[PDB]
Amino acid sequence: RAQASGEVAQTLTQADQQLSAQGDQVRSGLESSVDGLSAKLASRILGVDV
Amino acid sequence: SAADIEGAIEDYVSSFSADTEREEIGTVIDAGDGIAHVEGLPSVMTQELLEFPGGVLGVALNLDEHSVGAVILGEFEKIEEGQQVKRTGEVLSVPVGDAFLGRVVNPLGQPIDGQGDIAAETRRALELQAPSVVQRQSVSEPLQTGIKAIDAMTPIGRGQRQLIIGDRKTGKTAVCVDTILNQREAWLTGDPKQQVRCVYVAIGQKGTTIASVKRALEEGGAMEYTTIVAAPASDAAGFKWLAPYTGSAIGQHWMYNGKHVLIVFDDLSKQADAYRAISLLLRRPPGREAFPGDVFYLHSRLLERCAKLSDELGGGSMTGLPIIETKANDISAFIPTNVISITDGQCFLESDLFNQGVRPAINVGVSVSRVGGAAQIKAMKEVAGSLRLDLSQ
Amino acid sequence: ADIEGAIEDYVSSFEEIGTVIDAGDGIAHVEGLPSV
Amino acid sequence: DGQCFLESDLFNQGVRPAINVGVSVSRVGGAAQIKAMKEVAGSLRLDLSQ
Amino acid sequence: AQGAQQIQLMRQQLIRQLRTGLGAEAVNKAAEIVRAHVADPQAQSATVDRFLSELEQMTSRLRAASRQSLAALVEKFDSVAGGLDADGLTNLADELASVAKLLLSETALNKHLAEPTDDSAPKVRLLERLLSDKVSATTLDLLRTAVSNRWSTESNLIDAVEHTARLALLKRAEIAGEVDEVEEQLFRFGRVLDAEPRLSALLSDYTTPAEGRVALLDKALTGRPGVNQTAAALLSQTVGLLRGERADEAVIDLAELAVSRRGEVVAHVSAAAELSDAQRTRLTEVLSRIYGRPVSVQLHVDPELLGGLSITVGDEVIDGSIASRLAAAQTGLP
Amino acid sequence: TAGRVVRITGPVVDVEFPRGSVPELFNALHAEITFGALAKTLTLEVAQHLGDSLVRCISMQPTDGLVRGVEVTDTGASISVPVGDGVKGHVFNALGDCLDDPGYGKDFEHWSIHRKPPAFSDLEPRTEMLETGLKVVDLLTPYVRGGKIALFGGAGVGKTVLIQEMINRIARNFGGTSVFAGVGERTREGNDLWVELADANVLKDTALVFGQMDEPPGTRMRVALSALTMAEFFRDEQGQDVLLFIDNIFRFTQAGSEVSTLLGRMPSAVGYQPTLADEMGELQERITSTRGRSITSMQAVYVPADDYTDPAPATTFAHLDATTELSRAVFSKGIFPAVDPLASSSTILDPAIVGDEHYRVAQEVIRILQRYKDLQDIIAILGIDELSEEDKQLVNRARRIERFLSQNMMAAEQFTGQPGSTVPLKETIEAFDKLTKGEFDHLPEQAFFLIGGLDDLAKKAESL
Amino acid sequence: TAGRVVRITGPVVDVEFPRGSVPELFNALHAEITFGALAKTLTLEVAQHLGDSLVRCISMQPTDGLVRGVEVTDTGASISVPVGDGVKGHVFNALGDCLDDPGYGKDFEHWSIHRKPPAFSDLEPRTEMLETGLKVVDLLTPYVRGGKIALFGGAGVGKTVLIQEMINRIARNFGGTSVFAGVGERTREGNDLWVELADANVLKDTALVFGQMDEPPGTRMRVALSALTMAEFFRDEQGQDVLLFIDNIFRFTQAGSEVSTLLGRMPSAVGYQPTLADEMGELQERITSTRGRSITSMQAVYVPADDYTDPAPATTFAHLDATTELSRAVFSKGIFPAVDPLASSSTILDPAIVGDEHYRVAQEVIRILQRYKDLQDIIAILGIDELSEEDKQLVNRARRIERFLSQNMMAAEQFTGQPGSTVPLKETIEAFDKLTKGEFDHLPEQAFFLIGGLDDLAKKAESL
Numbered sequence A: 001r002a003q004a005s006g007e008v009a010q011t012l013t014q015a016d017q018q019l020s021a022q023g024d025q026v027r028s029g030l031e032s033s034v035d036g037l038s039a040k041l042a043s044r045i046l047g048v049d050v
Numbered sequence B: 001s002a003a004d005i006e007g008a009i010e011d012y013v014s015s016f017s018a019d020t021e022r023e024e025i026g027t028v029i030d031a032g033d034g035i036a037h038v039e040g041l042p043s044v045m046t047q048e049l050l051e052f053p054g055g056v057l058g059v060a061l062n063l064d065e066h067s068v069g070a071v072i073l074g075e076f077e078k079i080e081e082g083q084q085v086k087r088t089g090e091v092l093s094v095p096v097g098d099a100f101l102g103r104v105v106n107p108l109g110q111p112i113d114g115q116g117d118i119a120a121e122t123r124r125a126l127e128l129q130a131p132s133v134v135q136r137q138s139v140s141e142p143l144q145t146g147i148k149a150i151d152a153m154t155p156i157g158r159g160q161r162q163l164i165i166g167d168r169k170t171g172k173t174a175v176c177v178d179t180i181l182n183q184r185e186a187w188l189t190g191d192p193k194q195q196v197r198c199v200y201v202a203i204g205q206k207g208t209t210i211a212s213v214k215r216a217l218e219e220g221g222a223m224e225y226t227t228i229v230a231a232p233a234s235d236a237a238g239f240k241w242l243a244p245y246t247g248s249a250i251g252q253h254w255m256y257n258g259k260h261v262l263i264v265f266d267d268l269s270k271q272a273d274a275y276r277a278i279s280l281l282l283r284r285p286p287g288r289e290a291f292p293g294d295v296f297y298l299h300s301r302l303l304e305r306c307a308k309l310s311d312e313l314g315g316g317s318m319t320g321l322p323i324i325e326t327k328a329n330d331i332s333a334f335i336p337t338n339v340i341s342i343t344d345g346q347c348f349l350e351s352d353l354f355n356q357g358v359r360p361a362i363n364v365g366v367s368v369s370r371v372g373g374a375a376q377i378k379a380m381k382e383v384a385g386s387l388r389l390d391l392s393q
Numbered sequence C: 001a002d003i004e005g006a007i008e009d010y011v012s013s014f015e016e017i018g019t020v021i022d023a024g025d026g027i028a029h030v031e032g033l034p035s036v
Numbered sequence D: 001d002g003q004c005f006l007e008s009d010l011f012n013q014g015v016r017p018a019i020n021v022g023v024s025v026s027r028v029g030g031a032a033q034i035k036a037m038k039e040v041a042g043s044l045r046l047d048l049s050q
Numbered sequence E: 001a002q003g004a005q006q007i008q009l010m011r012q013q014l015i016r017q018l019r020t021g022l023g024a025e026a027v028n029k030a031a032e033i034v035r036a037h038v039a040d041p042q043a044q045s046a047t048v049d050r051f052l053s054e055l056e057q058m059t060s061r062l063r064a065a066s067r068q069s070l071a072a073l074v075e076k077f078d079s080v081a082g083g084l085d086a087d088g089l090t091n092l093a094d095e096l097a098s099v100a101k102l103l104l105s106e107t108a109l110n111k112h113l114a115e116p117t118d119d120s121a122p123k124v125r126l127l128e129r130l131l132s133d134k135v136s137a138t139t140l141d142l143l144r145t146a147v148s149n150r151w152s153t154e155s156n157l158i159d160a161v162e163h164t165a166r167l168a169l170l171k172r173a174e175i176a177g178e179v180d181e182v183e184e185q186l187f188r189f190g191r192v193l194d195a196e197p198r199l200s201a202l203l204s205d206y207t208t209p210a211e212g213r214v215a216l217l218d219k220a221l222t223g224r225p226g227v228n229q230t231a232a233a234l235l236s237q238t239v240g241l242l243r244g245e246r247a248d249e250a251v252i253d254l255a256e257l258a259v260s261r262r263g264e265v266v267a268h269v270s271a272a273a274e275l276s277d278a279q280r281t282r283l284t285e286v287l288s289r290i291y292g293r294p295v296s297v298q299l300h301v302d303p304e305l306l307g308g309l310s311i312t313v314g315d316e317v318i319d320g321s322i323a324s325r326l327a328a329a330q331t332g333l334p
Numbered sequence F, G: 001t002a003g004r005v006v007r008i009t010g011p012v013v014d015v016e017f018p019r020g021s022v023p024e025l026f027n028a029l030h031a032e033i034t035f036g037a038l039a040k041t042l043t044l045e046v047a048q049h050l051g052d053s054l055v056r057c058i059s060m061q062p063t064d065g066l067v068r069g070v071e072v073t074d075t076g077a078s079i080s081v082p083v084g085d086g087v088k089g090h091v092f093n094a095l096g097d098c099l100d101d102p103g104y105g106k107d108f109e110h111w112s113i114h115r116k117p118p119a120f121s122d123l124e125p126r127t128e129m130l131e132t133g134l135k136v137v138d139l140l141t142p143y144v145r146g147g148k149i150a151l152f153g154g155a156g157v158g159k160t161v162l163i164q165e166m167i168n169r170i171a172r173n174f175g176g177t178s179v180f181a182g183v184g185e186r187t188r189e190g191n192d193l194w195v196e197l198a199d200a201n202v203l204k205d206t207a208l209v210f211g212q213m214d215e216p217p218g219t220r221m222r223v224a225l226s227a228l229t230m231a232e233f234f235r236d237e238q239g240q241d242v243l244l245f246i247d248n249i250f251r252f253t254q255a256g257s258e259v260s261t262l263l264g265r266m267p268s269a270v271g272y273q274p275t276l277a278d279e280m281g282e283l284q285e286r287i288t289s290t291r292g293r294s295i296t297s298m299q300a301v302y303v304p305a306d307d308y309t310d311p312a313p314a315t316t317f318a319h320l321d322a323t324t325e326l327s328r329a330v331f332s333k334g335i336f337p338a339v340d341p342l343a344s345s346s347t348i349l350d351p352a353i354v355g356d357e358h359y360r361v362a363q364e365v366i367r368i369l370q371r372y373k374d375l376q377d378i379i380a381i382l383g384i385d386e387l388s389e390e391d392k393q394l395v396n397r398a399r400r401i402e403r404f405l406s407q408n409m410m411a412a413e414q415f416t417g418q419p420g421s422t423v424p425l426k427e428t429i430e431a432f433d434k435l436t437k438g439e440f441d442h443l444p445e446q447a448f449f450l451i452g453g454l455d456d457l458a459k460k461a462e463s464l
């Protein structure tokens, strides 16, 4: 039980690190995506493209 | 990875619609303590979901000639006079689907566990009629509680209703949570005819107690197949009155699809108190013990939907373990006796027995399961046929 | 003052047949019948 | 801040005043009680209760 | 296995946070773009026109006894006033208002006259011996018709007499050909009361003498040189018999009653800016098509909507406001 | 002509009609709910005339989805239910709509659910014993053929099990028609009863009408009257012996109480409607038999708060010839069927009817059990050895008599596993005479527990 | 703009506002009482919207001298109280106005006393045991660090003495911050606590808030929220470990009931407000600890008429991790701290938390005491003499256990003179294991009164 708990905690920590880095990269991409996403959302809200 | 994150928002934005419809509005003319009267809304249906400005939902219970008396299901603090009230055009209903497994949800179905939105398959109205006499079949499949006392003396079968009733700190929640945990082996089979899904409805329980139950379920691996419909003490009486119905609806969706469900209601006594509060705030004249006249129709309307459906309706089931807290070991009170008469059996956990060493503290004499042997395997039916009467003697 | 006198005359103005205005559960309310 | 419970049972038996000790108590008292009276009455309450 | 599930849940939570950030940034930027674009008058009118085109493709409080009695009294009033001149209608209105005030003050007389009875002869005698020598013949006939029939509640008699009094001025305007002027100018009173909540709450003659309330009204609202006389008389009559109802709501209901007497139904419209005459006529036509009645349109133009029109008629509302679109976009994000 | 819903408050709906077309009291009105998930035709029953053409009605179906201003049509007649030999073998709801075969009774003769009880001239007391095979019922509270029988009991003391057992014992050996009225009870019990009757081939002679507790208050008020209307058709229009089982009649009064405050009635006693006695008498006096045509009525009665002094049971006691009072004390002691031998009574337990031999044994058993009840106070505290020798021997007899009044019932095979038993009345009388005289005092107490007669008693004694 | 008073019904005031400037719920309104003897700036808290732009408000100061038609100005925000380390060491009232020096705290950060409870996602179950040093508490009702604890009882049973004892045991050596909320309790006790904390030098670490008896129901129910707001600020913004004593929290519900009666809301079961559960939860749910930040709350609870089934205690039972019922029976025997060992319970008294030995000893003690309670029925009449020998020995060691659970508390010194005693958990477990095993059955019962320890037990036994 203790060994499994320790291994699980280590896996959670390793995930919290690597997955956090992955999220940073995906956030960097989303930063470029924001402009187009907002433009299309505004176009839909107004209608008539734009 | 980033492709999916971008694509989800992109699909939402593309699907965004500018459609406008002839919505009809009323105006709040009175509010306070969870009740709001809405002038207008000529076409509002009884028990319809009204939408108040802050995303707060209410239910139209009273429909007079002047105003619509509605119970605010949420935070009523922001419900001012003069605010617009839109009708949802939808009778009291909650989302339902497999996405609710392993989640903690408000009586309205919107999650409160802090995780994502729940991908509901459909919406089920909370007041669909219970299966009729011709749509059921006898309770014959055992639901193994894992507790020797219950499975030997007061067996719980799939589709019947076992009221766990007792004083404070007697072991009611322990029994129900153990029942939920004991279904993990059945769940891992992957067989819908053996899997038992669970819905632990918490009513008027401090949030940390619901967290304790969720932790116990997680460590037992039970959240993989258990839903928690949490109406914690903080939420107004509306949620505490609606939570059993939300849980029953979530369970009924699975039940009518040929799956077996196990509903726990901790505590139906706190539902009765919440309904009393709502009725007295709506100024219904109360009955006995200050309770609304139709509290029995509340608990019955809830519990009678737990049934073993006939093969023509998929052969599903919903097993109800309502929990009642008797004050001062008085099983002869009003609500306890109502729920006893509504249910198929009772497990009376007595504090005296719990202190004497009898854990869980089943008063064998008072307890009974009217399904009895039909809810036990042949082996236990043979080795424990007369165990309860022998112990009472 | 004269309003009170007119009201007095109107009240003193009063077969007598009434009308059931409300009924239910074994009780019936009968408008009219001033001399009942 | 404390009650002097006069029991009728003691009253009928001739114990007047019928101050029922044990049940009778003073909370804000004790601090306000002349030193001699406190010294002589310290054991009296225990004696009568016993 | 539980740890594996927990790391998978952590991944799902991180995906949720990334999606929430992306959606929040997108919606904020979209709101900025929408506000910038709709700000130009040309774009604002374009949105209004697009909304109009989209639309192109798309006694109530009186019970049975009171409802029938008010209907009968209105029929009698229509029969009688049809042959009366503007001065006659004015006399009818003032006498009806005076008797309504007397009934409001003399509660005992009101209860005696309004208490239902099989035979109305005692009621007619009571009305005659008290009013026959104080008011004109037509007003006495209308009062006899009102009292002779049966009402659900005592207050309904005051309501019916006051309704007839209002109809007196309404028909006086109708014969004078002032219907449009009175309707619009009563709407102007409604706007003024709405813009001054303290004033509207203060015109409650239930809390003070009706004479003082009408004096305040004259000093503040109908004392202005530009008010139509018929509208001023109507609103003064209504407030002097207000009986606790809010003056703003009373005036709005009075204007609705006037337009209903014309036959049309008034729809309150809010827009980012006043629409063009072509926009006005298109809106009127489409609303009439939707509701099957000639719709009178009143514009409450406010910039908060930040775009298309919003319409409120009766209990129904059309919500094309760009503010509503922004709210829907913000709330609908996953 | 049609009405208009004005006010909806739970199961109560107010309908405003034109002046010349106000529906009469107890008429049936039809409204429409068009919401897709709950669409239906809602049957309302006029309960009050409020004035100004307003009527106030109880809803036979849930009012969820109903909209103010929705049209309400007057049927012109009270709620009517099908009657005839056709109803036998089928399952109906309170409105007369067949459940197991929808649309079955739409072409049968329909009788109004409301009708006056038979005149006092037609009534004749019934004094014939209905031997059932249960020791306690046959000995202490003999049931009356053509009379009224009740099974009082608190919450969950075995009313349904006992009423099912008595269905098995009477109807299964009875050539006439039978009617069951599931008034506000558990639907699982009703389904089990339906399956059992189908399997035993007794359904063809049984008509079942269910208004179970999932239904709104109106259906629980009127399901009893519907089943009872079928019963009186079988009584008056066919001269045939009829059994009318009602489980549970208290639910009629309880449903009345639920709508009592919404109808504008001030509460009475413990939250009950002021019209409790009037309504329950109107319902009960219809159940009576008239000379030449007998209804053997057997109606369970619920005792709220397990308190026999509650107004509903107290007012129901007056409408019954035989009364089996179940109790939670006996149930906890393990003496199933849980009949309270002392509080229970029967009007046919008269030496002029059951015979002096039966009466003497019954009264001796009652005396022994009453003395044991009195002594239970001393025994629990002072002890058994401090009693008189006669009282000690009486205590032994009393314990054995209490445990012999228990019986392995046919419908309770699930409770105990072992099959049921039928004890003839004469065997019961002989066994209890012997018990009171002590010929079985030497056997252990458990020898008498759940044992159906003297032969089985000897077998169990030899087994122990 | 400003409003206008239209009705006054005791401490409840109706105020009419312009058609569009109606205040929100829980907003703070200000009215002026100008009568010279008692002129004041009355503070109102908006509680309902009655319609017609009227709002019904609860007065914080007594509405005496208030005249119809006086101007009412809304502050636009709910009642706010000061927060920060500056509040520590000072005495505040319900509205945040400092009492020991009235100008204090005006420039401090202000927090609204109305706040949503922490989101469910931030709640965790607290299970770390808090070793108080009381034998009864540390054995049978192990208090929870970071959890909610209650001290139930009637009048004169020892609730306040226990509160001050746990202030001595816990607060005196606590590393963080403390808050005390005098809700409807004596002002004399508030002053006594103030001087005690000043003497013990604990005042600098604690913030005192008082809403004592003489105040109207408004402050008597909002004082708990004010103290909870200070405690929440210490919990969240400063990350300090917080203690929160509340004496007495039943007065919160009592003031709620009074306000409900004044607001026109229909009474509940025994006259309490219909929202008893909701109003109780909106407070208790806030007293919770969250994941990284703890709030150990201890709440005295009044049990009116010594009726533990009263709706207020019944509701507040559901919001507690450790409950210590104080009973009149234990109090009459002289067994201070007055705890009923059987009614009291804790959620961490599980073998997985307190250990196998602790749980075993606790369960055995509870078993012995339950058997003693069950034998009371015979003990009262016949005495100890007539019991069985096993039960005789059990009752003897049960009396010794019952008396050993008594302890000489520090707060009891002022009453008894004898200094208080602390018993560590290990010694308590060992002592009660020995007691249950019978190793002290030879010592006189008098030796176990108020003794607190094995060594001191031997000392007193030698004295006797």
Ligand SMILES: Nc1ncnc2c1ncn2[C@@H]1O[C@H](COP(=O)(O)OP(=O)(O)OP(=O)(O)O)[C@@H](O)[C@H]1O
Binding pocket: B166, B167, B168, B169, B170, B171, B172, B173, B174, B175, B325, B359, B360, G346, G347, G349, G350
């Ligand atoms: N079978 C058992 N054996 C040992 N301890 C038990 C058993 N069942 C319950 N307990 C313990 O007894 C106490 C009962 O807690 P539980 O929450 O199960 O009771 P409850 O009746 O649901 O209480 P409440 O109304 O406060 O929620 C807890 O300490 C639980 O750990």
Ligand SMILES: Nc1ncnc2c1ncn2[C@@H]1O[C@H](COP(=O)(O)OP(=O)(O)OP(=O)(O)O)[C@@H](O)[C@H]1O
Binding pocket: D025, D026, D027, G153, G154, G155, G156, G157, G158, G159, G160, G161, G162, G185, G248, G302, G336, G337, G409, G411, G412, G415, G416
């Ligand atoms: N440990 C003790 N030793 C001696 N006397 C005690 C002890 N505890 C309490 N008492 C006595 O009992 C009285 C009870 O005081 P306390 O303020 O605790 O009462 P309470 O009933 O809890 O409070 P309240 O009156 O506010 O409800 C004390 O004043 C003292 O007289």
Ligand SMILES: [Mg+2]
Binding pocket: B172, B173, B174, B266
């Ligand atoms: Mg529990």
Ligand SMILES: [Mg+2]
Binding pocket: G159, G160, G185, G247, G248
């Ligand atoms: Mg105190």
